[PDB]
Design a protein around this ligand. Structure first.
Ligand SMILES: CC(C)c1cc(-c2cc(N3C[C@H](O)[C@@H](O)C3)ccc2O)nc(N)n1
Length: 279
C-alpha cells in the first residue's frame, strides 16, 4: 500500500471509498478501492484473469490487516456524468450504439466464463477519450442502493438467477441513454416492481412460465396493461426497439443473451465515434 499516494477522493462506493492514486514506484495512475473471508479472497482473486478490453482491468489485490484493497486501471469518467453533461442535447445515437455494442461484448466475455456483474448501473460504466466504454466492478457481487436496473426475477425473490439479469440492466441503461431519463426510477422494491409492471404489463403465466410460483409473487398484484412499446423509447428506430424489447423479456430464459444481441440488425451499421469530454 505504501507504494501509493492518494491523488484525491473520486467517489464513494458500494463496498468502499474509491481513490485516484499514483504508484509511488511506477508513478502510474490507478483507481484504488478500499473494501476477511477466504472465499471472497479466492473469489475476487480469480477475477484477475478475467481480462477483456471492455472490462475495467483489475491490476492487483492487496489484503492487509482486515484492510482489503483493489487496484484497478483508471478511466476519467462514468456514464452517469456523461449522460448529465449531455442532458440538453442527448447522446448522439451512433455513440449510443457503439457503447451498447462494446458493453455487450464485455458481457459476452464474462458470461461465457460463467461470471455475472449482478449490479450494472451508469456509475460502473467508465469511458475514456478514445471512444471506448468499460464495465467496472464485475464479479464483486458474488464476492459480497439503486434498484432502477434490477431484473424482475431478482425482485421476485428468485435466488438462482442467471446472466440474464445483466442483460436486463443493460437494456434499462440503453433506454436511459436514448430518453435522457431513467426507465424504471423505483424508490423501493415494490415501487420498482410496479413501475416495471406499469410499462411492460403485469406478468402472468402466459408471458412468464412459473412466474406465480415465485417467492415474492402476490396474486394481489394490480393488473396493468402492457404499453405499446413506441411510447417508451421514442424516437429510437424499429431495430432499436426490437433489440431493447428482447433485452427486457420477462422470462429470463427468453430474454436475449449478450452473444445473440451482438448479431441483431440494430448493430449492422455500428461504428466507433469519439465522444467529447471535458476533463
Ligand atoms: C465521473 C466520475 C464518477 C468518475 C469516476 C471514475 C472511476 C470510477 C470507478 N468506479 C468505482 C465503482 O465501484 C465502479 O462502479 C466505478 C473506478 C475507477 C474510476 O476511475 N473516474 C473518473 N475520472 N470520474
Amino acid at each position: 500500500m505504501e507504494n501509493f499516494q492518494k491523488v484525491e477522493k473520486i467517489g464513494e462506493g458500494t463496498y468502499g471509498v474509491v481513490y485516484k492514486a499514483r504508484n509511488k514506484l511506477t508513478g502510474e495512475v490507478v483507481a484504488l478501492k478500499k473494501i476477511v473471508p477466504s472465499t471472497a479472497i479466492r473469489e475476487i482473486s480469480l477475477l484477475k484473469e478475467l481480462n477483456h478490453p471492455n472490462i475495467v482491468k483489475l491490476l492487483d489485490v492487496i489484503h492487509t490487516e482486515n484492510k482489503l484493497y483493489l487496484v484497478f486501471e483508471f478511466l476519467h469518467q462514468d456514464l452517469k456524468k456523461f449522460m448529465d453533461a449531455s442532458a440538453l442535447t442527448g447522446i448522439p445515437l451512433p455513440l449510443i450504439k457503439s457503447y451498447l455494442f462494446q458493453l455487450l461484448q464485455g458481457l459476452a466475455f464474462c458470461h461465457s466464463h460463467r461470471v455475472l456483474h449482478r449490479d450494472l448501473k451508469p456509475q460502473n460504466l467508465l469511458i475514456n477519450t478514445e471512444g471506448a466504454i468499460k464495465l467496472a466492478d464485475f464479479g464483486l457481487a458474488r464476492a459480497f442502493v439503486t434498484l432502477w436496473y434490477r431484473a424482475p426475477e431478482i425482485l421476485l425473490g428468485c435466488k438462482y438467477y442467471s446472466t440474464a439479469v445483466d442483460i436486463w440492466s443493460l437494456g434499462c441503461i440503453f433506454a436511459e441513454m436514448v430518453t435522457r431519463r431513467a426507465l424504471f426510477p423505483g424508490d423501493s422494491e415494490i415501487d420498482q416492481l410496479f413501475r416495471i409492471f406499469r410499462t411492460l404489463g403485469t406478468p402472468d403465466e402466459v408471458v412468464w412460465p412459473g412466474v406465480t410460483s415465485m417467492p415474492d409473487y402476490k396474486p394481489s398484484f394490480p393488473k396493468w396493461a402492457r404499453q405499446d412499446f413506441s411510447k417508451v423509447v421514442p424516437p429510437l428506430d424499429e431495430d432499436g426497439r426490437s433489440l431493447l424489447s428482447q433485452m427486457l423479456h420477462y422470462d429470463p430464459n427468453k430474454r436475449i443473451s449478450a452473444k445473440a444481441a451482438l448479431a441483431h440488425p440494430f448493430f449492422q451499421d455500428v461504428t466507433k465515434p469519439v465522444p467529447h469530454l471535458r476533463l
